[PDB]
């Protein structure tokens, strides 16, 4: 079985490279962040522009939804994160304390904490209600490319250009595990699987890898795309068939069968690197977004 993703909508309006797109957990919305210092909200099903959220002083590398779809957090070159009330557009809090660009961010499943990673080589844990930094982890020896909470928030996974993925205990801040394979390329992305058993890690040697982090074993590798320079998001697609979805530096979206590791689809149409992809939580919908020479977001839909 193979999906049949087809282009449905192209979303224009960011004035520089897009950096990340994320569907709201309730499926209603797509949020996008850009080097143009803006967040934009779009209808998830029709791509209709909803609103622009502004206030960062420099470009934004990442944005993420709270689990109730009410809040966003963004990570900016202005070395802050910002917590936004999406409905009002208000900036509820500005999270300050990284000493270099903030690159990646996520809420925990409760959405009472935020985790961030930065060019300052640190991972930080922040209280959502007060905006105060609770912990600073001396996590890596190079910029932190991704941070993600596991299913119950007990764990944080981080990835870094230093070649490592690390698993941290949220409560204590202890480093519980370091994961690295036989080669040491920079790690450009990591996230836990939906069931929390696995981590999916991207490295800048054109490779995605599915790990059992408890056993510290690499279970699957996904290849065929181009990824040597950019921190490209990757996703688990679970609404229809079980796929792996990723952008690529050859301007395509790649879709692999999770179990067999075969490429099952490539989506063509962006005019620059596909920096980011997201999978809708209930419908077979992929959002993709591209860099400076393209500046657009595309929505693709499939029957499986």
């Amino acid at each position: 079985v193979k999906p049949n993703y087809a282009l449905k909508f192209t979303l224009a309006g960011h004035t520089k490279a897009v950096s990340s797109v994320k569907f709201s957990p309730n499926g209603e919305w797509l949020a996008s962040s850009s080097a143009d210092k803006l967040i934009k909200i779009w209808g998830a099903y029709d791509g209709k522009f909803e609103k622009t959220i502004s206030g960062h002083k420099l470009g934004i590398s990442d944005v993420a939804w709270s689990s109730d779809s009410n809040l966003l957090v963004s990570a900016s070159d202005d070395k802050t994160l910002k917590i936004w009330d999406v409905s009002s557009g208000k900036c509820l809090k500005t999270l300050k304390g990284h000493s270099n660009y903030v690159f990646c961010c996520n809420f925990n499943p409760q959405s009472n904490l935020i985790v961030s990673g930065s060019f300052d080589e640190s991972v930080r844990i922040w209280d959502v209600k007060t905006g105060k930094c609770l912990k600073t982890l001396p996590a890596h020896s190079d910029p932190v490319s991704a941070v993600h909470f596991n299913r119950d928030g007990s764990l944080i996974v981080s990835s870094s250009y230093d070649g490592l993925c690390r698993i941290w205990d949220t409560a204590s801040g202890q480093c519980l595990k370091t994961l690295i394979d036989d080669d040491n390329p920079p790690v450009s992305f990591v996230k836990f699987s939906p069931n929390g058993k696995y981590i999916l890690a991207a490295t800048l040697d054109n490779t995605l890898k599915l790990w059992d982090y408890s056993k510290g074993k690499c279970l699957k590798t996904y290849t065929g795309h181009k990824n040597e320079k950019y921190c490209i998001f990757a996703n688990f697609s679970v609404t229809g068939g079980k796929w792996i979805v990723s952008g690529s530096e050859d301007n395509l979206v790649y879709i692999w069968n999770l179990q067999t590791k075969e490429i099952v689809q490539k989506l063509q149409g962006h005019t620059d690197v596909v920096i980011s992809t997201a999978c809708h939580p209930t419908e077979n919908i992929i959002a993709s977004a591209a860099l400076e020479n393209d500046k657009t977001i595309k929505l693709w839909k499939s029957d499986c």
């Binding site: 520089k16 490279a17 897009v18 950096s19 990340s20 962040s33 850009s34 080097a35 420099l58 470009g59 934004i60 590398s61 990442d62 900016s76 070159d77 660009y101 690159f103 060019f119 910029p143 250009y161 920079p186 450009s188 800048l204 320079k229 950019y230 921190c231 920096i275 860099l291 400076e292």
Partner: peptide, 9 residues
């Protein structure tokens, strides 16, 4: 700009 959009050089 934004660091993600620049890549690692």
């Amino acid at each position: 700009g934004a660091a993600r959009c620049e890549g690692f050089s």
